[PDB]
Amino acid sequence: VAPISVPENGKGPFPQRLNQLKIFYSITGPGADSPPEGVFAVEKETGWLLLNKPLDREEIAKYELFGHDPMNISIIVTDQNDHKPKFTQDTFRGSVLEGVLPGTSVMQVTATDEDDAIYTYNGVVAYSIHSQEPKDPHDLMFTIHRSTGTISVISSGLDREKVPEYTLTIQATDMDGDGSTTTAVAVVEILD
Amino acid sequence: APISVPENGKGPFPQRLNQLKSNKDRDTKIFYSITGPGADSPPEGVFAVEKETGWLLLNKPLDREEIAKYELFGHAVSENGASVEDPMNISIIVTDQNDHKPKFTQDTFRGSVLEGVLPGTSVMQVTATDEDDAIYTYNGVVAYSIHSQEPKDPHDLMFTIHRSTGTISVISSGLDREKVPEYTLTIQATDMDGDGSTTTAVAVVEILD
Numbered sequence: 001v002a003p004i005s006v007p008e009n010g011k012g013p014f015p016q017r018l019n020q021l022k023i024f025y026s027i028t029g030p031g032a033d034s035p036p037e038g039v040f041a042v043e044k045e046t047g048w049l050l051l052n053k054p055l056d057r058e059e060i061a062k063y064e065l066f067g068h069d070p071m072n073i074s075i076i077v078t079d080q081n082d083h084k085p086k087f088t089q090d091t092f093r094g095s096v097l098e099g100v101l102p103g104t105s106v107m108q109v110t111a112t113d114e115d116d117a118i119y120t121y122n123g124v125v126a127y128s129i130h131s132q133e134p135k136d137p138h139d140l141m142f143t144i145h146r147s148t149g150t151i152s153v154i155s156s157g158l159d160r161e162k163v164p165e166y167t168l169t170i171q172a173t174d175m176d177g178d179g180s181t182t183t184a185v186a187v188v189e190i191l192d
Numbered sequence: 193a194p195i196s197v198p199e200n201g202k203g204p205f206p207q208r209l210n211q212l213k214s215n216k217d218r219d220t221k222i223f224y225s226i227t228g229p230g231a232d233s234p235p236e237g238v239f240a241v242e243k244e245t246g247w248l249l250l251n252k253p254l255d256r257e258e259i260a261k262y263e264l265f266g267h268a269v270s271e272n273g274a275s276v277e278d279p280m281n282i283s284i285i286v287t288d289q290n291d292h293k294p295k296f297t298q299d300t301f302r303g304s305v306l307e308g309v310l311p312g313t314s315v316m317q318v319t320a321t322d323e324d325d326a327i328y329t330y331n332g333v334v335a336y337s338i339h340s341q342e343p344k345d346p347h348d349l350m351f352t353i354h355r356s357t358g359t360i361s362v363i364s365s366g367l368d369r370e371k372v373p374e375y376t377l378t379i380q381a382t383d384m385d386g387d388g389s390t391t392t393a394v395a396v397v398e399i400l401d
């Protein structure tokens with residue numbers, strides 16, 4: 001019995017048929033007779049294996065049950081994008097000497113997403129800079145690496161006398177840029 | 193055994209799905225191959241199969257809105273060209289991912305209602321759309337809401353919207369053109385039945401004599 005993929009948060013309705021087993025039929029393991037109990041069941045005469053409730057991947061990502069030659073049953077729970085990204089802090093801070101060459105790493109911001117970042121992009125965060133103030137000696141003096149969140153400086157006019165500090169409104173966007181966006185602030189200090 | 197494959201996967205690719213296996217187990221060496229829309233006809237090359245190991249392969253990420261389902265055929269053929277069994281009905285089901293934000297059909301909606309109607313009465317209906325699946329997942333299911341009301345007169349919270357259908361209603365006596373001829377409600381449609389992504393429009397309700 002090849003593993004069974006079941007998207008979390010399904011509509012159904014329930015109870016809901018998964019795969020028929022090919023002589024009375026009964027199923028066992030963590031999910032059926034062991035806790036969490038009664039999540040999966042089986043029509044004893046027809047053998048249709050059943051799901052009784054919508055699943056929550058974050059709670060339980062898979063199951064290993066047994067049909068009754070003991071048939072192995074693997075239930076893999078595929079992800080849905082039911083968690084929004086959140087920066088770990090409201091304000092991030094970092095600094096550089098004014099003489100740093102373009103490319104210099106200022107800081108690394110981070111946003112968390114409880115969804116799956118292995119097989120899907122639902123937990124994959126895309127970073128971007130919303131805006132910069134002040135815009136002196138010009139705008140877009142900093143980049144943020146899309147996946148690492150490393151803020152770098154790419155300008156050459158860093159002058160503490162003129163501008164001792166830059167505030168960056170930054171963004172974190174799940175589904176690797178296509179999904180929900182959250183916002184935080186990164187304050188760059190030009191060191192004396 | 194239909195294979196459920198979420199669209200928009202990270203892979204990497206190619207990516208194993210299931211291992212095919214014939215009836216002639218010990219007897220002879222067997223070559224596997226697949227045919228159909230998705231394999232050797234348009235769109236070609238999307239799925240493959242490892243000739244000897246029989247592993248069924250996905251070569252690129254899928255898009256349910258492009259193609260929701262594949263119906264392929266797997267073929268067991270000995271090194272001598274001979275076959276013993278019918279083709280294998282391989283059914284790939286592309287499960288939906290929430291890759292479409294809800295969109296209101298209009299940015300401003302326009303309704304009217306008589307100043308002296310029973311509270312509960314329908315005023316108008318708004319509608320946002322979502323191209324994701326609404327049958328097997330909530331990804332395409334929109335949940336409506338009223339963010340805010342202006343003016344607050346006679347009082348606040350005079351209307352309500354239906355979560356499913358988007359039918360706006362009056363839930364108050366004391367509508368009077370004389371006092372308040374028109375209201376402006378900020379409305380929102382949010383997919384995943386309220387848990388996903390939100391979009392915003394405005395419903396402008398006129399009061400009638």
Ligand SMILES: [Ca+2]
Nearest residue numbers: 056057058082
């Ligand atoms: Ca969940």
Ligand SMILES: [Ca+2]
Nearest residue numbers: 083115122174
């Ligand atoms: Ca997410």
Ligand SMILES: [Ca+2]
Nearest residue numbers: 079080082115
């Ligand atoms: Ca999830």
Ligand SMILES: [Ca+2]
Nearest residue numbers: 255256257291
């Ligand atoms: Ca798609």
Ligand SMILES: [Ca+2]
Nearest residue numbers: 292324331383
């Ligand atoms: Ca959607």
Ligand SMILES: [Ca+2]
Nearest residue numbers: 288289291324
């Ligand atoms: Ca979709």
